[PDB]
């Protein structure tokens, strides 16, 4: 997988520093940023347990949109079932601190970009945050970064027929990082091995 130190260096290389709050566990409080773009990488587990899975949250203060990009695109019920993760409190806190009307639009990905056995979740979150820092009104799709990868229905995550698309996404992710991150370039072989497409495949 990816450690926090790795993800912070790569998000800084991709130009997201001006908006990046850092890496957090499931207790990420939410956004206190009524007038500034902001984003964060958040784990589904608590720091006590050790990391489990990475997601990215991002906030556009002009449209009052809170984006959630979790690389498998699970539904809210599946996030609670699979990872015991819920994010109602951070949405509530974000709306009360950051919008005079106490309302926001939540826009969340509903497709998987990551293979079921891949350990590249944190790297996909970095890639989405480059998309957000440059296209904060359309980060999920229809932008030069996200056009390199292709989501598939989360209900088809384990089906053979979507694997080539998910493997192509992983290849495009690593190539994107080679062109934009000196830190990834200098740790290329190591990060590709620790995050590989079938890193977690059953034996």
């Amino acid at each position: 997988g990816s450690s926090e130190q790795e993800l912070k260096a790569i998000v800084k290389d991709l130009g997201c520093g001006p908006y990046f709050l850092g890496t957090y566990d499931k207790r990420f409080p939410g956004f206190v940023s009524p007038h500034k773009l902001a984003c964060a990488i958040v784990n589904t587990a608590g720091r006590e347990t050790g990391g489990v899975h990475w997601m990215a949250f991002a906030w556009n203060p002009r449209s009052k949109t809170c984006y959630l990009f979790e690389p498998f695109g699970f539904s809210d019920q599946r996030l609670k079932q699979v990872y015991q993760f819920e994010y109602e409190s951070l949405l509530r806190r974000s709306a009360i601190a950051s919008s005079p009307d106490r309302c926001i639009t939540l826009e969340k990905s509903t497709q998987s970009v990551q293979g079921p056995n891949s350990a590249a979740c944190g790297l996909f979150c970095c890639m989405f945050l480059h998309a957000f820092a440059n296209w904060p009104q359309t980060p999920m799709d229809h932008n030069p970064t996200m056009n390199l990868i292709t989501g598939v229905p989360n209900s088809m995550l384990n089906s053979p027929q979507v694997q080539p698309t998910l493997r192509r996404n992983q290849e495009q992710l690593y190539s994107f990082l080679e062109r934009h991150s000196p830190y990834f370039r200098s740790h290329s072989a190591q990060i590709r091995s620790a995050t590989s497409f079938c890193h977690l495949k059953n034996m």
Partner: peptide
Amino acid sequence: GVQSLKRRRCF
């Protein structure tokens, strides 16, 4: 990229 769902949430 990915398709997404939008939901308005007020508190």
